[model samples]
Target: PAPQTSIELFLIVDHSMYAKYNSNSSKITTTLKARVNIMNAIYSSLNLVITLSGIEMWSAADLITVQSSSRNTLKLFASWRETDLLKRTSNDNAQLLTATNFNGNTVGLAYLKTMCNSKYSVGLIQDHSAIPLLMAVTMAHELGHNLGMNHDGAGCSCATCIMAPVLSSGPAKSFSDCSKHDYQSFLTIHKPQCLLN
Candidate 1:
């Protein structure tokens, strides 16, 4: 009805990081708010609607043991699929992910094809890059991938593009022209498949 333009989100954040950072409920709420604000700012123009369907507080979901790097493409997806809180189905927008601290040097990782190809699965590591704002961009960057957008590299507004390879390195701001074009293209191609009739 009225052409679907929304995506559902489920987030799992490791409590270990919360403990390490001594994150209080207020702080966590602020973190979520900031990320939501960031995405709203970017997608505001494109009629893309993102909803926080759920948030899973992972008590001991450590990524170090899962892989040499917490950001392993396969491990992330597999763990995401196996995570208890992410009860996704083929019929729903079903974008599930883990945004937790890892021991490796990765901002975020997800296979665009493996993602919205059918369902959405992803992970975000908050170790080396310690800014919450960076984390916001990182998640958006991966979601961009989930939405079929890609970084053609150094091509989009000098890396400030949220869809760029290193979203943290950029200004952590808006998307590049190419990114916008790609996302619009993706909506045309994949939205129907994800949305119900």
Candidate 2:
């Protein structure tokens, strides 16, 4: 794992998600940690470690109005992460964990080719499942996009793999070969310095 990249991820819990846990901070922390643990295991093979640098729970209310529009939600979250969240703590990337239902079937969204970029290293994941594994897989998928991994194409054998265009059956237990190549290639070009630290 030499030259390993450490992703300092900041997780934000939206109000709706907080309400789902009955506004219990302890329960929120417990569930979130479990989800992050699963996500870390998924990235272990890549030598990319995801660390939870910080968490902000929208306990009082939603800081930004979250609606069914996944695109708009991510836009707002990106702005908040740069202007507000960054003011409080440091993180290589930030993701919003929300219970809000989106208009489309999409469970997560993030900018491609933007891993470790301060302005664009952010995404949103819907808490669509009761099981932590499912959520973790979706989060990992979104983060994969941020890391410049395209969806597994027809040439790739990606059954039950992260980076598959769509998710079904169950959580992906591993990353596809295509995804591995993409990560390696992306790192070479981007050379994100934040990840090195």
Candidate 3:
């Protein structure tokens, strides 16, 4: 089947992690620009357009509640705190993402999982101390789950592959053939489209 002619939107949805970085201010989130660029990397093949709505930080209560995976709770989290939200799930074509706390081990969370009965999806990447690029890679991999892709290139040069479950200790710039194929398969069905500018 041809890819869908419609476009879907994704939000980076940063959590308290940005608060720790910005200091004394919850208004300036530092994720939008980079996320826009990274998501665009696959916009051509995935046929999806990802836009960073804005940067937001959550309160302590919001952090505790944000972990709830139910759709209603997802809505609740957004309602309680407006910053950590990209958009409400009522839109029918939105995905929200955040970053996990500072931990060198275990780089990401929520890969290939469903939330809100699969109506709304959530992705969180490892952050705070990792290389920003690695964090971006982790977020990309989490989004890859949105594309229905799994880990690939386990023992080879993961430093350059996109689907390696565990990233190698270096820089990565592209996706493996297996990873690329899975994305194509996903886009074929999901039919993500780009916004007409």
Name the best candidate (by lDDT).
2
Number of backbone collisions per candidate, in order? 0, 0, 3
lDDT of 2 by residue, 6-81 (tens): 8999999999999999999999898889989999999888888999997889999898989789999999998888
- lDDT for each of the candidates? 0.56, 0.88, 0.49
Residue 15 of candidate 3: its Cα lDDT? Answer: 49
Off by over 4 Å in 3: 1-15, 22-28, 42-47, 66-104, 111-120, 128-130, 154-159, 189-197
Sorted by lDDT (best first), the order is 2, 1, 3
Q: What does candidate 1's lDDT look like per residue over 42-145, in tens digits? A: 66566666777666554555533444365464455545555533454322223323334345455566656334343344545453345656767777777777
Candidate rank order under TM-score: 2, 1, 3
- TM-score winner: 2
- Name the runs in model 2 displaced over 4 angstroms: none
**Model 1 misplaced stretches (Cα beyond 4 Å):** 1-4, 60-68, 71-83, 88-105, 113-120, 127-131, 168-172, 195-197
What TM-score, to 2 decimals, does candidate 1 have? 0.72
Q: Clashes in model 1: which pairs?
A: none
